[PDB]
Ligand binder design. Sequence first.
Ligand SMILES: Nc1ncnc2c1ncn2[C@H]1C[C@H](O)[C@@H](COP(=O)(O)OP(=O)(O)O)O1
Ligand SMILES: Nc1ncnc2c1ncn2[C@H]1C[C@H](O)[C@@H](COP(=O)(O)OP(=O)(O)O)O1
Lengths: 353, 375, 174
Amino acid sequence: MSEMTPREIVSELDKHIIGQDNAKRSVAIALRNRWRRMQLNEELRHEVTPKNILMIGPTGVGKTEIARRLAKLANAPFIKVEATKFTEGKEVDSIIRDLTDAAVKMVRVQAIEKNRYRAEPSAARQAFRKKLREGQLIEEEAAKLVNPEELKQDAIDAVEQHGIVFIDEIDKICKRGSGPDVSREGVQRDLLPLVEGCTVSTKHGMVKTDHILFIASGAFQIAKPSDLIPELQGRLPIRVELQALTTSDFERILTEPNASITVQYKALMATEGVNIEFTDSGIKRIAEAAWQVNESTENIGARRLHTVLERLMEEISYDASDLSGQNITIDADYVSKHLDALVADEDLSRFIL
Amino acid sequence: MSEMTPREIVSELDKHIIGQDNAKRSVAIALRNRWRRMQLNEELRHEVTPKNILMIGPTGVGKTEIARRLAKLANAPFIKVEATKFTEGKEVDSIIRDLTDAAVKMVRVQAIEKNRYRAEELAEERILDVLIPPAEPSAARQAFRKKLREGQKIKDAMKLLIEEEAAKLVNPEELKQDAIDAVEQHGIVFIDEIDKICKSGPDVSREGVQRDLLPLVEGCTVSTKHGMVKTDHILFIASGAFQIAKPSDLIPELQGRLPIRVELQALTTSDFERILTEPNASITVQYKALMATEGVNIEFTDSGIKRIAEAAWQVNESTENIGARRLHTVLERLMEEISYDASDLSGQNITIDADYVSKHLDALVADEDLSRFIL
Amino acid sequence: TTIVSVRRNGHVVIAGDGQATLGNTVMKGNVKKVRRLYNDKVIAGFAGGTADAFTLFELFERKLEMHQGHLVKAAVELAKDWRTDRMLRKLEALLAVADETASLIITGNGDVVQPENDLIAIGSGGPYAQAAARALLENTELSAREIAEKALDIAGDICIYTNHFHTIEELSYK
Ligand SMILES: Nc1ncnc2c1ncn2[C@H]1C[C@H](O)[C@@H](COP(=O)(O)OP(=O)(O)O)O1
Ligand SMILES: Nc1ncnc2c1ncn2[C@H]1C[C@H](O)[C@@H](COP(=O)(O)OP(=O)(O)O)O1
């Protein structure tokens, strides 16, 4: 739908994700082929199929955030699914069903937005209108303005054309080499029709999967993509590896991204009348703290930044009511005071952090 | 339905599939028996049953594409089902259910193509009644008809009339009943990897799927929300590598319901070069038109095509042989730099030469440890 | 069989013989009992069946990727799965591995061991090599490569299961 060029897509993704440009470039090519397909003639539009992507890397390096912001960037329907959920069980067709139910709520809430603002004047008329806005039918008018037959037919077209599905941890359904390998590879066969252009029935309507884009992800440390079934390897034309995040990336993720968690904590304490400010040295030691826990115990990627920051701010967030009108500074000494005692004890870090 | 002769079918398949002529000749005989049966009398049309085919060969050599282009050639309903899906569980009758659901959407969208034309005429006559209410077309009737086609709730109204008119023009009892006739008369089903259900523990569950499949080929009736379908005249295409097992390992009732057998040959490097170019809407042609959308002109040298097929061949030998599917992964890896820059390269003529292919690929093909992840 | 590892002056090496015995006869004299792993950042050796080591080495690289190349923690996870898995428990071999961090032994009992001074000597001739490598390391300035080389030759003269075909993989970190 959107006519953004691949660089315009990556530039928008840099506003949220930090680095991992190769993954940003790969998703941009897939979203740009969508607009390229519409410019083609009747024959080629059926033959061309979406260039599905397989992200590869350790957990918490942003494989999902790229997929989320991408679907949010295109206003496309989106869903994430854990491939292991089908090891036990649920049918694989539910993926398309839930994706449409999300596309329905997406177009519907977006349809309400068009119906919201709609939902010589006399001098006495304007007078009461002014008293009314000062303070002292949204249902019936938005229902009158909405077209329920349109919202349902639209969400299908939003799924069939723009829909995006992210299959997390696909590497875990690869053969480990006999028992699980049948159940694991059996899930791969059950997913095959969805990428091979099958049709799935839904209460909202009959959806076709031919042109849906898909984004698998997996660490592939145990298994490798070549362990995937041959029919599945050919349906994932684009491959990319996401690099492990460094301490410098943690320093950037804390601040540079739009609505970064540090900015979120600042606005939250602003609600209490408190002013937060992080020193560059304080952001440095926070990133240094999260890296130590990942190296000391288990590496969960950037997700460690969340648990550390909340552990650091827990005293302020509790007192923020009584500290109204005060300006609190998070300096390097403040970071070492609330954390170095915790990071030093690995046995406690596995619980508190 | 179609009256094409078996050679006419193979010649059309040659436009998409490369080689594998025996598989093309075998499927052509099955589609021709369809037309041959309708010419027969009331008795023989019942006794004659479709000549089901069993494809055999390594993965990715086009077994499925023949079945896909064959059904697309006949405009028949089609579905691909993995036989291993039933080892765990779902009922086997779902095959006919999902086939009819594809047949429903197929006849419906095709019915919209007919309604797409008449509905615009009747929709125009409806919207002209508000502009020039009636008391040879009137002069104002055409003066408004011209401004309408030139383009212009009003704009929303033209869409609502396509539904009421296409609904008024369509015959749902002739449509939902047409997909059933399309399934029963023309239906096609491709059962991939049937060799994996051949034969103690798994052998019961494996052969149990065969007995569950048996009624569908021997003939039966399945209930669906769209209607009641009979499977007697549906055509089926089973496929399997049969390296672990052999067709003789299939249950005897199933071996006799697959009269036609054919083995598909492994593709060579020369066939890869043909698949890249010769087939209609070949992936090389697809990349060319795609870059054309950005204003760029792609061109592949014969040696550049030759070194891509050699690249895909080396990976299949160096690691795992996935057949012609390897061509897709190699080509996108080669074109990823152009596909990203195509916006800024508008108005330029790019040439994919042998030096360009070796520049972007040979470093990757050289490292087998990396080829498994990237290619 | 004999395999030796020495670490000195920013250098560490692993050396092993090529003899493969079947009963009282020599099956193969040029066996490669040493190789590199994990992007050539790790050197390793094995005493036992060739395939049993190739299976353990591949899984060991997997454990390194999960732990970002940490040698000790990956060795524990390998020793953990080795004793645990019914398939891996059947494997019979003596692994030796080292990186710039430290050298250690791994066994099918699940035991992970780092020798004194990171001096590894395994195989039927291992104790003989440890006796010679211990003598040179304390009484000479020889580099770790020269010690593992001369020590393995002495073990081949003594052990009947060890020969003088040699394979070495040095790692310099300084
Ligand atoms: N490269 C990156 N830039 C910015 N934030 C990141 C990031 N990688 C991870 N994060 C943050 C944002 C997410 O809320 C959280 C989890 O990331 P994720 O996308 O779920 O990783 P994964 O795809 O490995 O599961 O970590
Ligand atoms: N003979 C052939 N000609 C052209 N393309 C082919 C081909 N064989 C395979 N391909 C390509 C096109 C398909 O999109 C892809 C999948 O092939 P397939 O028909 O599924 O093989 P199989 O049925 O053996 O699994 O490979």
